[PDB]
């Protein structure tokens, strides 16, 4: 498990820090990654920090962000200087399909997913996630993420295929095309909610803009 730390409110240009606290046993994936999301807009990939200790960082934020590490206390850190009223927004950390429950920080390649999709109980879906410089191979990772109101995000697939624990059967993904594809298989209404796609891009994570798929 995961859970994020921040100060809660912030001044504008002056710094933000967070502290995500990792516990438990297992440690799936290959390090830490922060993400946020601004009120009522999308995710945005912030950074990573890998097992070795090496970051990758999100470039059009490069400049103002740092991401360190303390082995000892099992944490990961996020600083981000010169906060702008734009940086207002919900801070997770994230590691593998398995997300932190997100603080709220309030200031004092394109990938394209279908942006809404309705469907019946016991029905199948396929939900989307194009890239516009290419095709999506495995070589792109592809994890789908699902929000279930409000807030909270789950991991559903990553590795393009790999079900996640404790994820129902009827969620399979796939490649269609030059596409990266999550098929429901038999939706229910527990599924309506919102699903966002990421592609690894060699350094760097892209969200979609996710899908909010109805199940009437
Ligand atoms: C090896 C090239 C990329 N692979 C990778 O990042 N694997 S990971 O640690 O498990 C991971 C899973 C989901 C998210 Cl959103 C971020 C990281």
């Known amino acids: 498990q995961l859970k994020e730390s921040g100060p809660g409110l912030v001044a504008p240009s002056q710094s933000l820090s967070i502290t995500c606290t990792v516990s438990?046993?297992?440690?799936?994936?290959?390090?830490v990654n922060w993400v946020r999301q601004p009120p009522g807009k999308g995710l945005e990939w912030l950074g990573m920090?890998?097992?070795?200790?090496?970051?990758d960082y999100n470039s059009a934020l490069k400049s103002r962000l740092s991401i360190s590490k303390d082995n000892s206390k099992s944490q990961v850190f996020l600083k981000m200087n010169s906060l702008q009223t734009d940086d207002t927004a919900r801070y997770y950390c994230?590691?593998?399909?398995?997300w932190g429950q997100g603080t709220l920080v309030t200031v004092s390649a394109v990938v394209t997913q279908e942006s809404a999709l309705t469907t019946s109980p016991g029905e199948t879906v396929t939900l989307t996630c194009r890239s516009s410089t290419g095709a999506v191979t495995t070589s792109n990772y592809a994890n789908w993420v699902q929000e279930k109101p409000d807030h909270l995000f789950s991991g559903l697939i990553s590795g393009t295929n790999n079900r996640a624990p404790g994820v129902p059967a009827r969620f399979s993904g796939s490649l269609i095309g030059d596409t990266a594809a999550l098929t429901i298989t038999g939706a229910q209404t527990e599924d309506e909610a919102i699903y966002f796609c990421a592609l690894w891009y060699s350094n760097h994570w892209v969200f979609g803009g996710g899908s909010k798929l109805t199940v009437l």
């Open positions: 438990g046993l297992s440690l799936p994936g290959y390090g």
């Open positions: 994230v590691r593998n399909v398995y």
């Open positions: 920090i890998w097992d070795d200790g090496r970051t």
